[PDB]
């Protein structure tokens, strides 16, 4: 019974566009976070800051969070490496030192040239990362060096516009070497996989703003996924979200956590009439302000070219396009 | 009596690396031949990292003679471009070398390396202090609508140490970033070419090169013949399988060819090689009633570009040996 909270172990919570939005914490994000009893985990793909630097970030924007909270890529690409390299295997590292200690944490070698003999190459956005620390890694890589990158997200986005990303340092070695790297956080389940095994939690959750990392992680991990609307995906990108992007639950911010689970779930709804026809989705009508979207996205999901939402009188008009969708 | 390749020709367009010298050795016979040609020696490189004084000046250790006028660059023919279709003045993001912004000053655009600074333009070359922040400056220039070139889309640069990252990464990470593409001003770009012969009125160019994508490309690009050379990058097998615009009109071992006759290196078929076209195979036999080692690859060439993959098989011994001694089977 109650709240969505409540009926999950733990949760598994994605920093960036989610708990704040860049210098400033989401709409009641600092109240939700403070009157839930499971276990709070925040999770990120960046890899430039270390567990503590992150957490120490949190508790400047009022939070309370240590290192022991934090899941980043740095440690599951870490814990992945580790996997499949010989204890104080050879590592040359791209990225921070926050990166080279996770290696080093793990009982591997951290390493920074191709005179250095390294096993494997390990990448994670570094803001001073030049062309002499590329090269180095190509020629590890042209070697047939094991290649992990932490994300791969072409942009960065920040105050002055949308910057380069780790995926674009990760596609100057892929044209350089002609190889893949494999990707270590999300969207791969191992990141999430290893957060809930931490502490053996039997019922986590997700909880993310991005479609492509945070939901379809949910998803290859197996596991439930809230959407929140505070950061990168809208409402109308979850309505047309392709099958292994879709998430379970639907918000608007971290205040859901406090809503019941199945008020935020995605599925029909009894203040929407929805009818699939030739081509269009038509929705008549018969709330925190999300069920028309719930119950738009329940119909599109169960039924190619993209069906238009078309509205079937005022009060489904008004509502489409308070979230767009016409 | 017959007349040299390089007499035919008021200018040669030579490529430096692959064809002129492989890093720290001069090719075979470069010096020596390059010494005697009485036609304008030009050198040209894609490469936007040394000036053209500093090319001259490497030319001038490993042997030969050469100034600065003497080398044409990938840099120089960006500038113009960027001067081609910017307002004097217009300020210019660098990602390269000084020297690559040096060329940019030289055409009356100002020379930049942040976004705070306007620039209308963006222009990238290869440097090797060049860092992510240098790409985020560009990254935010390029999106604000500023017009993007590249002296050349090489995924690695070829050095002592091994296979580097070319200026062709660096643009695959803005690709990435921006989502958008450069014009590339260096070869295969005709304009590089183009314009170099219009610097001294010549009126009977030929291009040389070890790189069909480049030099070749380019030359047919321009409308101007070319030399393809054995020593650099591309081997006889792709001169046989390259795709039209990527076929050169001679080819030979090294720039001694520049004093064979054009009528030995052309491409087309041969008197000591029969070539049969037929089932999927080119079948070649020694023939019936002086070779500098290359006929056959000039045969099977135009056998191949005369006429879905084919095959080359030999019809019978002397053959089988002289094709093996250039892979192709
Ligand atoms: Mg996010
Ligand atoms: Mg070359």
Known sequence: MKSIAQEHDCLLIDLDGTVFCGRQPTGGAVQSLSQVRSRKLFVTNNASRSADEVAAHLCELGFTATGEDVVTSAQSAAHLLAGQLAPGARVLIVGTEALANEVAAVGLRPVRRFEDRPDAVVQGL?????????????????????????????????????????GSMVAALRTATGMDPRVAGKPAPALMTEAVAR???????????????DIEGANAAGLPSLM???????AWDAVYAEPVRRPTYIGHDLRSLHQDSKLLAVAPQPGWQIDVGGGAVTVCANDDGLSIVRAVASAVWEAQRPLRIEAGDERARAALQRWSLM
């Open 199 to 213: 502490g053996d939690f039997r019922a986590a959750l997700v909880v993310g703003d991005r479609l492509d990392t």
């Open 228 to 234: 929140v609307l505070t950061g990168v995906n809208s």
């Open 126 to 166: 570094s803001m001073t990362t030049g062309w002499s620390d590329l090269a180095e890694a190509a020629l590890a890589i042209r070697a047939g060096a094991l290649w992990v990158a932490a994300n791969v997200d072409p942009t960065l986005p920040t105050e002055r516009g949308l910057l380069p990303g780790n």
